[PDB]
Amino acid sequence: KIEEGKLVIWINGDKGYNGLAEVGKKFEKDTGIKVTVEHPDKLEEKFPQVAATGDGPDIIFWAHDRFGGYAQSGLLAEITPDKAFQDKLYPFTWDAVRYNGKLIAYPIAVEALSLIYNKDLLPNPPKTWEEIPALDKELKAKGKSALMFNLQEPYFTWPLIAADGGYAFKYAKYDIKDVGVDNAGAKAGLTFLVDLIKNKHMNADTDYSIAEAAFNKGETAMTINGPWAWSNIDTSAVNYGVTVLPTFKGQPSKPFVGVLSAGINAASPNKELAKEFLENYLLTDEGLEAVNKDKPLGAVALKSYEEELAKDPRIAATMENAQKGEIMPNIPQMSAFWYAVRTAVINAASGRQTVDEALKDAQTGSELYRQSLEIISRYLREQATGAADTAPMGASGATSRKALETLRRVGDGVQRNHETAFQGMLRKLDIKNEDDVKSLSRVMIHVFSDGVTNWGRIVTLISFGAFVAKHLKTINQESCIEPLAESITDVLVRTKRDWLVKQRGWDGFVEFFHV
Ligand SMILES: Cc1c(-c2c(-c3ccc(F)cc3)sc3ncnc(O[C@H](Cc4ccccc4OCc4cnccn4)C(=O)O)c23)ccc(OCCN2CCN(C)CC2)c1Cl
Ligand SMILES: OC[C@H]1O[C@H](O[C@H]2[C@H](O)[C@@H](O)[C@@H](O)O[C@@H]2CO)[C@H](O)[C@@H](O)[C@@H]1O
Numbered sequence: 001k002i003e004e005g006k007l008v009i010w011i012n013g014d015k016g017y018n019g020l021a022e023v024g025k026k027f028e029k030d031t032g033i034k035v036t037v038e039h040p041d042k043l044e045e046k047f048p049q050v051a052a053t054g055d056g057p058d059i060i061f062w063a064h065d066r067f068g069g070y071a072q073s074g075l076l077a078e079i080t081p082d083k084a085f086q087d088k089l090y091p092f093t094w095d096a097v098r099y100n101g102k103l104i105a106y107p108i109a110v111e112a113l114s115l116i117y118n119k120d121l122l123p124n125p126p127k128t129w130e131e132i133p134a135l136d137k138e139l140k141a142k143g144k145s146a147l148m149f150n151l152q153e154p155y156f157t158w159p160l161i162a163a164d165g166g167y168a169f170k171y172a173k174y175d176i177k178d179v180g181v182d183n184a185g186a187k188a189g190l191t192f193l194v195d196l197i198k199n200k201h202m203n204a205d206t207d208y209s210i211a212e213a214a215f216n217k218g219e220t221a222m223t224i225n226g227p228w229a230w231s232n233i234d235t236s237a238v239n240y241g242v243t244v245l246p247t248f249k250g251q252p253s254k255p256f257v258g259v260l261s262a263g264i265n266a267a268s269p270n271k272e273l274a275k276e277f278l279e280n281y282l283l284t285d286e287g288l289e290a291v292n293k294d295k296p297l298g299a300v301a302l303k304s305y306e307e308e309l310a311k312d313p314r315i316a317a318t319m320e321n322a323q324k325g326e327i328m329p330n331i332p333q334m335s336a337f338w339y340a341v342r343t344a345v346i347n348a349a350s351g352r353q354t355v356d357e358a359l360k361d362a363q364t365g366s367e368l369y370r371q372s373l374e375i376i377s378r379y380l381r382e383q384a385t386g387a388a389d390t391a392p393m394g395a396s397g398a399t400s401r402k403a404l405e406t407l408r409r410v411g412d413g414v415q416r417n418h419e420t421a422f423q424g425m426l427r428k429l430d431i432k433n434e435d436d437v438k439s440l441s442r443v444m445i446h447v448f449s450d451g452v453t454n455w456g457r458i459v460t461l462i463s464f465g466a467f468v469a470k471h472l473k474t475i476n477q478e479s480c481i482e483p484l485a486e487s488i489t490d491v492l493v494r495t496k497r498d499w500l501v502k503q504r505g506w507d508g509f510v511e512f513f514h515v
């Protein structure tokens with residue numbers, strides 16, 4: 001599906017895509033290979049959908065956080081630069097694009113949010129979130145507002161949510177069992193935001209465009225944005241500074257740090273062309289300058305050029321915020337985490353849910369994959385061997401234990417009553433190895449995805465997995481069970497995410513079958 005002898009590149013509409021296209025023309029000069037740069041809407045949602053069918057761009061640009069998802073689904077080429085090239089970029093940038101030990105992208109630039117303030121309105125920007133209300137009242141008396149930023153994307157609100165002890169996945173590797181979305185710190189940050197809105201210091205409908213227009217016209221004294229934004233402010237002749245984000249309850253705002261990264265599509269027939277492009281045209285002083293001059297990249301991964309721009313106090317401020325922040329995890333569940341928190345912030349801001357209701361649903365949504373896997377993996381393995389897993393359930397272990405106990409009753413019942421259809425389907429598929437299992441997964445993915453949503457169909461999906469798992473054990477294919485459990489889990493949580501959260505996840509399963 002992807003055309004050989006050219007390069008199609010996807011990059012977000014806020015990045016320097018005219019600059020990248022100029023690096024594209026220089027490549028075409030040397031090679032006679034045309035480079036098309038596109039910035040489609042939602043490209044971070046479209047890439048996984050199209051790339052799975054062997055379609056999409058040759059190169060996708062996004063922050064590193066989405067790339068583990070892409071790599072796990074087999075959508076990215078392993079990149080293998082030689083030592084001489086690896087040494088040209090900061091090790092910590094390479095770390096951002098490492099997944100299960102393999103480099104899955106080229107790092108381009110380190111991004112963090114800063115407080116951007118209009119020096120003519122606000123000579124001294126506020127050190128604390130707590131002083132922004134009184135600053136707003138002072139500025140409204142003069143026909144201005146204190147602060148506007150994008151309330152539609154949780155990336156911009158996260159630094160406040162995280163300040164007093166909100167976190168996504170705990171680090172001390174990343175404990176995926178430990179989600180800090182509905183703890184006291186997260187509640188405190190989101191409550192402060194909702195109070196700002198309730199008190200008319202901010203408007204819940206403010207998005208990227210409205211904040212940018214209002215700051216760049218000198219109507220609001222402050223915004224929160226990344227380096228990409230600076231170009232448009234330079235154009236506006238607002239006298240702006242870039243500074244440390246305000247503290248909350250005495251603690252730094254903790255922005256989620258992104259490394260803008262360039263991944264090669266696994267389905268691309270143009271991998272050597274993509275590698276030559278990214279290594280020897282883009283990731284050079286001249287290539288990054290071309291992009292940076294269009295929309296600023298931040299602290300670039302390329303040591304030689306980072307040194308040249310390091311003296312810029314806007315970069316200095318970006319790295320001060322990044323140091324108070326945390327590098328985003330690249331784990332496959334990041335997409336689910338962001339979707340959950342996006343919904344929680346929009347709903348709390350709008351009044352559709354209270355902060356407690358919004359962050360509860362977000363915690364459920366963020367924990368959904370790992371919780372579902374634990375139940376589904378334990379059911380298939382204990383069905384297959386006749387022996388339960390001794391290891392303790394961990395956090396939400398009561399939910400997991402009671403869901404496992406319910407599924408034992410209800411799942412054993414479907415395997416007994418539907419033995420005929422299950423044996424029939426198992427006998428048709430000639431399951432004798434991991435290849436046969438992967439093929440089954442593809443079919444079962446289709447049949448489950450295509451049908452209606454209720455606990456019975458969900459039990460049927462998991463119970464068929466149990467039925468198959470018993471087969472795999474008896475034919476010395478036990479190593480195929482975990483990958484089957486991961487397949488079932490993946491399609492369950494991806495295709496029924498909203499319904500599952502609406503039911504309070506596995507608590508709803510336990511209550512629905514309570515007798
Ligand atoms: C495992 C399965 C599925 C199935 C998957 C499947 C299919 C093919 C594969 F290769 C692998 C997995 S993933 C999946 N996920 C959800 N539901 C599924 O099935 C149900 C229908 C169903 C079938 C059999 C037993 C029970 C049962 O539903 C009980 C139920 C339903 N709704 C509420 C409450 N209870 C459905 O789609 O609604 C499936 C679909 C049809 C099906 O059998 C259909 C009958 N066939 C006749 C011909 N024979 C050779 C074969 C049998 C079977 Cl065995
Ligand atoms: O809002 C959730 C969103 O946050 C990040 O996306 C940032 C991106 O890193 C920046 O490069 C810039 O474009 O703004 C985006 C926010 O609108 C995550 O990278 C992304 O995965 C996540 O969905």
Ligand SMILES: [Cl-]
Binds near residue numbers: 197348350
């Ligand atoms: Cl409100």
